[PDB]
From a paper:
TrkH, KtrB, and more distantly related KdpA belong to the superfamily of K+ transporters (SKTs) that are found in bacteria, fungi, and plants. TrkH or KtrB proteins assemble with their respective cytosolic partner proteins TrkA or KtrA to form a stable complex. To better understand the mechanism by which the Trk system functions, we determined the structures of TrkH-TrkA complex from V. parahaemalyticus in the presence of ADP (TrkHA-ADP), ATP (TrkHA-ATP), or ATPγS (TrkHA-ATPγS).
The TrkHA protein was crystallized in the presence of 10 mM of ATPγS. TrkH remains a dimer and is in the closed state, and while the HN2 interface is preserved, the extent of the HN1 interface is significantly reduced. Although relatively small, the rotation of the N2 domain in the ATPγS bound TrkA is sufficient to break the bulk of the N2-N2 interface so that there is only a tenuous connection between the two domains. In the TrkHA-ADP structure, ADP is only found in the N2 domain of TrkA, while in the TrkHA-ATPγS structure, ATPγS is found in both the N1 and N2 domains. In the N1 binding site, conserved residues of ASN74 interact with the adenosine ring, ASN31 interacts with the ribose, and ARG98 and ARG100 form salt bridges with the γ- and β-phosphate, respectively. TrkH protomers from the TrkHA-ATPγS are in a closed state and each protomer aligns well to that from the TrkHA-ADP; however, the TrkH dimer interface is almost identical to that of the TrkH from TrkHA-ATP.
Numbering used by the authors:
A (entry chain D), B (entry chain D): 4 to 42, 45 to 65, 69 to 456
C (entry chain A), D (entry chain B): 2 to 62, 66 to 483
The structure:
Amino acid sequence: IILGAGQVGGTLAENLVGENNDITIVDNNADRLRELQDKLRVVNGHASHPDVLHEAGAQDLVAVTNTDETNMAACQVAFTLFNTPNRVARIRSPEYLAEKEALFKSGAIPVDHLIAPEELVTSYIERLIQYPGALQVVSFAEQKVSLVAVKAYYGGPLVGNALSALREHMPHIDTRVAAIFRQGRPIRPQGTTIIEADDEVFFVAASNHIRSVMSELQRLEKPYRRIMIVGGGNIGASLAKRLEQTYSVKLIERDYQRAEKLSEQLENTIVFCGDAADQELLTEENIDQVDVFIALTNEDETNIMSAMLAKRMGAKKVMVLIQRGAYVDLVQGGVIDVAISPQQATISALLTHVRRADIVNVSSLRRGAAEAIEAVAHGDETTSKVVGRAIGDIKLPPGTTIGAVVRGEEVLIAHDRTVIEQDDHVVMFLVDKKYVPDVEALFQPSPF
Amino acid sequence: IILGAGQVGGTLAENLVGENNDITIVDNNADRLRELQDKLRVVNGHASHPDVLHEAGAQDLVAVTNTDETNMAACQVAFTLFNTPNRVARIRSPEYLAEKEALFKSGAIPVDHLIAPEELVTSYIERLIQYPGALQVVSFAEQKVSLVAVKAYYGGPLVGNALSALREHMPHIDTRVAAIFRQGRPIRPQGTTIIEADDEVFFVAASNHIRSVMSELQRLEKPYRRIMIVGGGNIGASLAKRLEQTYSVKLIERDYQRAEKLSEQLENTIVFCGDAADQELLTEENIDQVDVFIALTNEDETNIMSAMLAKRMGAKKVMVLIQRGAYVDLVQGGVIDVAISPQQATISALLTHVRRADIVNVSSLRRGAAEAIEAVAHGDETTSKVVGRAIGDIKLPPGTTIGAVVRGEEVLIAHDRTVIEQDDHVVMFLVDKKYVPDVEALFQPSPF
Amino acid sequence: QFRSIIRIVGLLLALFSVTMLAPALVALLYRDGAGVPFVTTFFVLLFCGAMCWFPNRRHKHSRDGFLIVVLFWTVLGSAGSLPFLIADNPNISVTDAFFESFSALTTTGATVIVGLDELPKAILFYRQFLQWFGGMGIIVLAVAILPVLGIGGMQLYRAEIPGPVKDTKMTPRIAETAKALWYIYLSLTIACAVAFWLAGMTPFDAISHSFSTIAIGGFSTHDASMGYFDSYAINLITVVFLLISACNFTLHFAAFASGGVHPKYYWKDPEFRAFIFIQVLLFLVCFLLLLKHHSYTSPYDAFDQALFQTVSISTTAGFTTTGFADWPLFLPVLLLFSSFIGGCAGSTGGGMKVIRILLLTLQGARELKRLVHPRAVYTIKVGGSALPQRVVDAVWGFFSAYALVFVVCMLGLIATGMDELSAFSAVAATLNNLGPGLGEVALHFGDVNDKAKWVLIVSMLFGRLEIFTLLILLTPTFW
Amino acid sequence: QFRSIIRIVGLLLALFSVTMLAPALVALLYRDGAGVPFVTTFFVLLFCGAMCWFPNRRHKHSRDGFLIVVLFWTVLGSAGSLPFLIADNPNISVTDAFFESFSALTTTGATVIVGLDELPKAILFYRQFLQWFGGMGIIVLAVAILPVLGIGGMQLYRAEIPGPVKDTKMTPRIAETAKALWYIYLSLTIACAVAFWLAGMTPFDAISHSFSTIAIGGFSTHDASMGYFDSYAINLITVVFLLISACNFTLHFAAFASGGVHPKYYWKDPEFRAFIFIQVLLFLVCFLLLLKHHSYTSPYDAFDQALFQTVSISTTAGFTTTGFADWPLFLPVLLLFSSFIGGCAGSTGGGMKVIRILLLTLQGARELKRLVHPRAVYTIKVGGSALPQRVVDAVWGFFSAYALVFVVCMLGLIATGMDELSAFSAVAATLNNLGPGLGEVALHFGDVNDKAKWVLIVSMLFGRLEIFTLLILLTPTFW
Ligand SMILES: Nc1ncnc2c1ncn2[C@@H]1O[C@H](COP(=O)(O)OP(=O)(O)OP(O)(O)=S)[C@@H](O)[C@H]1O
Ligand SMILES: Nc1ncnc2c1ncn2[C@@H]1O[C@H](COP(=O)(O)OP(=O)(O)OP(O)(O)=S)[C@@H](O)[C@H]1O
Ligand SMILES: Nc1ncnc2c1ncn2[C@@H]1O[C@H](COP(=O)(O)OP(=O)(O)OP(O)(O)=S)[C@@H](O)[C@H]1O
Ligand SMILES: Nc1ncnc2c1ncn2[C@@H]1O[C@H](COP(=O)(O)OP(=O)(O)OP(O)(O)=S)[C@@H](O)[C@H]1O
């Protein structure tokens, strides 16, 4: 049961329905709801009133309003009067985190699982800094496997080389190209494909050994030392409170009364008072020695026109925060090295709870029609079409290509000579997402 | 004398100073002013008070505040108490136009020349519709000459062909490639250069015969019939009042009380009530038959995420209105066919008054470092280095290439065999704008 | 409340008596006539009009306004019957008289007197004079007192409509509209009156037919309206003096404001721009159907007969210069339907004035467009600025009330022994203030039953008052 | 655009042929009948239905919806004429047949065949069956496909009805209204059918008169509708099975959603709350006028005759169990006016459904109140929440279009040689979908001229389609 027809509710309502699971979304915004009703059953609803929420739940939880407070009431109304299972409710306002342990580990509020957006993006941004040279890092439902994306340039070890020409050596830890994004549109990896310049080459890597992969491909640049931020809001302060202990941080906030509290809350950080495009402040404070220029503002236009400037002065890298998640590929690449989306990360976390124990887990690498997925193979060779059969012998739908296999806690890179065993978590790249209930029907065990 | 340190005042303050002319700008915004003071003398000023305005004017007019009303007072204070010459003052609010004739042709208000931004952009947008297939149209100080830009694709008559291979025939009316923009960065035209795909090929054309040029290159598509707009503001209504008589207009306004007045003011137009991303409204109202999808809103983010959708459904063409002029090249090309800037058109009109009778007139084709200019050759062969000498024999600074010559009312396309006569208006393309006082010193007559 | 009202009533009864003198003066300047009932009435009314307001000379000041104007016609209409009751020359019954009193004052024009040609020339002036009086009455009311009330039906009437074009000053009302409008009224009556003399007919018929065309009444001193002299001039004068008198008098105020600057004031009013097209298309189609039928030997007569009948029936005038002999049955019916589109608002006219129809045609097509473009925003074009949703409601509730009365008044005439067809032919002729029955040469109002003539009076008021004025009388909220 | 439309057309033509079998089956199960035309039609239509969609099996997806539903009746109605043309047992003209084809399918009930009592029992099943098919047709369209288009006639309808009451599982906009409603349809036809068997009449007349009463119908296997057996039971069943079948079927959806919790769903719907009062007040006044007239000897007959005629004429049913012999002329007229207020919306239905009248009476009285309190704020009470100004406009533009067609369709029947009264008696009977002429002397539709019998077809569509559906076809904006 949802309570949103927004980019969260709409992206879920689109992603989750393969007839595998059934749900009902709620929203007072009719023009958006019956538009989102295409993507199931729609209960028009007013707040968390029991009529809509409570009656829909039993005999016929995700709560994504504008506000957190309304969301908490909805989980309590469903827990008090029906005792409904699960209950994931997004909570944004920081103080509900600052006392989360007191509140939530006392069981008072009924959130079974939290989705704190400010926390998820800020942890994510720190995850890119840790592996220098990584454009995007992809996370699946299984923590063990993950994709790491790099950028191919002129003079790179990976430009123009034949894919299989790199597959002849298996040095130390090994990799595999699961996806190739170029010009904004997706190229599935083939033996015949050549790595041209300015591509998003998505390498596969065991989550434990990611840095090892990038250094074997000679792409692990020097660790970042000097960082620069531009947002004083919820993400800007959280990131500073995480980086001042390990990196030389500088912040730029244009609202004094907020710039003061950032001076109080951050002991070892230098917060400023200026606009992002203040050339004097960027020159006066040594921007030609900046290694990354995270911009975390409200308006996506401001992040770009400032992160484009910092590259021009110029910084070693730049990152923006495109709030709506629909344009991440469009702004990314070229002048701006990295573009981050909270609504392609907030939804990334929601598709790991909903999809739990299911056939497919939708990765964080969803952009346009392409999306990476993780399919689960249940049943022995008698009740499954896809078990025991070697990877090269599976008649996968067009565009789909297996990149790896997760078996328990060990990541096996997909090779044509590999055997899929029972209860595997296969990681693959779909160029076209209209094929899921074909995959969802292929891996799914026949009746038991 | 200016009164702004904004994109208008800053772009002027940068463009106009070649030591050819001297000015003084006024602005209460210190951090922006002494930043804009780099680009001359700065008078810190409060409103149009005579101390700053009036004292600066005599013994030591352009007025670009946030408001029109303040601007009118400044031109009157300078005209009443000193009787200052010229006086160009921007006025945006429509009603000051609606009664302009009553007010201004009565001489009451002292504006010698008006710069009404809403009018200039809306006339400009109609200028692209008139020549289908034109990405951008460039206007110089001389109305007679103008550049027309096109887009080279696979299957185009101009892709891969050698430039000179097109110069062997001079059929009917003739053209010439004055500039080539590709990948956002400028390529000056050479004999060795080849026209690759997705380029901005800037053809030269006499303003009278522009359509004739594009049809001889087989690029004049069918005239537009069905237009769609998305802004209900000052530009949206003005454009509708100009197109409902000749084109089948549809408008989309999301504020009802304003959608009603548009139904009253526009007799033959269909105005709507909806958000730009309302897929139902775009499908319900036959968008797959739209020929151009002008988007004229406040937020540049909204124009893009809607004009990208209309191309996707899809429309035949799309146009946005990127308010700040600094990103016109970045958004343009690719998915969105055309991007318009009012502050690359408001400034385009101001550089035709200021530069009057001067050595250089800065064209409307300013993007990044590249800008097209028009240089005037005064003096007979005895007091000028550049007169009588054939075009191929002028040691022009690097990147500069002559594209045409305007002599009185006749446009002579530049050929290597052409002779520059006295009092000519030469049209050329600078890839790098740091060279102007070299050109400004080359064409300028030696002492008389 | 009622006290100062009876002051107004008895005050008007006195003014009505002063009118009775002018007829009897004719019954002595002429002596083909009987004048005593007019002088007997002049006295009895002056008393009965004075007796009410003398003990009620106490002065005091919307609920006031509705109850006045139903008394302005109820009282004056009853008082109008008195001359006919007294005189033995007509030999007219009471209900026939109350009918002819109301039919005259309401400017209806439906008569119940047979062979009025040879009736005295004194009673023949009083009938036309009462149309003149009710002709003036509607003008002062429609332009001034009535719009304030909220049933103005004049251009963008609703409550606020303070003089429309060239509305300067306007602080004095009724009193600055009763004085100024009279000059147009008198200067229009005389112009036609001497024009009929220049056509050739007697002074009496020249004048007493001017009281009738200008007041859009349709009466006559001859049984046949303008077939008494089938001369193109008289028709072409009666045509042009009905078209001129049918349009908005607030637009006839384009002559008393700094001289003759007419055409701009006239043509820029959408009601007059639709009065012409509706008038032309009517006569145009009523002509082609006569030429294709060879109803008349020479197309000049057909032009004469048609161009008069469409403009004497669709302006609510009610004049008959023919017998529809060679006309298809299907022509009197179409003309009768055109009666609902009466003269332009603010003028002496019929039921659903051009705007009510203009607004109705405008709005009815918008509902046809929205069916394809549901999410579009549409407006009404009539004036400079679109109409408020109050006015669009005030037309569509007026159509509803109209076809609510027209059906109850029909099943009320049916019960009294009439037939379905004659009822329709009667109420559509009385609700619209037309007069002639129309149809395939049908209604003669003498044949009408006694208890139907009452219902007809009940109806002709409903049309003369804007239907709501009397419909709210029986509401619980008003009382 | 047009391509995928013809796919739908040929698909329905095939489905219509599959219907043709059930008649011919009876012309062989029964011993009185002619089956060759039905089986001749079954083949030729299956071909002509298949020939269109085979080269058009290309699938593709508002302007689409209006043009479908005028083809849904134009195509199926023409196809319905074929059996009558072929069979020589009722040798009958083409236009008489197209009329009887449309009159049947459009659920009108206006017949042009004299002495159908002894006609074969095979053509007698096909006429009643076509009413059943058009009975189902209106239900699937009125409640499902038609509301989305923009003309609702369904409680609050403009284009936004989830049914309001139990708005659940509405995903399939038409695929679960055709499936679920059929059970109500079949469970209603059988109940009355066996009830007529318990009344005593033959299986054929028992069943083929259920096809006629459950749908709005009006047809019969006897010249006189239900005077064939003047038994109170048959009337009292036909009365209750018209009242039950006339109202909103989404209120009959109070039985298929968790069993029989009827009374709350029914009575809390204001349309049903006004369907009863309008039905009671009619019969109540139609009863006191019969008792005061001593039209019938015993008030049980008067009760029987009245309570059936008001509920067979105001529901658009069209059943005549009398000749209005002792009835005042003034009763058939009043009943014909009551035809406009047909069955509750979303059901086999009349010209202006109860809401259209209910909304009309509500809004018309608000316009009477505002006249006294101009500065007050008023709203409409009908549902839970007051109506959007879109719907109030969509009622008042519907009245205008109605009385625009009804007048053009009238001056179109007059020209073809009919008389004013008979035209009115005809179009008011066809626009509302009521077969009887309804006068003291009836209109018998054989006497109607050939060209008029076309205008009547043109008209009965206008009523069956919500008038706008076909009125926008001739707009410039649609094309
Ligand atoms: N009282 C309310 N009850 C329920 N939903 C509400 C209420 N007020 C606002 N909303 C929701 O507000 C949402 C639109 O705003 P938001 O979702 O907050 O914007 P957004 O969060 O940036 O978009 P998202 O994150 O993709 S849902 C819709 O889901 C509405 O249902
Ligand atoms: N043009 C700008 N340049 C620099 N900083 C800015 C600019 N505009 C806004 N900011 C800062 O960003 C803040 C906006 O933060 P809030 O709206 O309160 O929370 P938030 O930052 O929007 O939430 P998120 O996580 O950043 S989307 C402002 O208060 C300033 O601190
Ligand atoms: N009282 C004032 N006196 C002088 N300048 C003022 C005053 N108030 C605002 N400004 C000007 O406001 C400007 C910043 O806002 P705007 O220029 O209106 O924004 P903008 O117009 O979109 O930018 P432009 O068009 O490139 S100047 C500066 O030029 C300030 O000098
Ligand atoms: N998301 C949107 N979709 C569609 N129309 C919008 C949207 N946002 C704003 N508008 C319209 O654009 C208007 C903004 O106009 P104003 O700010 O009053 O003047 P203006 O349009 O900004 O001036 P210009 O010339 O367009 S920059 C709003 O009032 C709406 O009419």
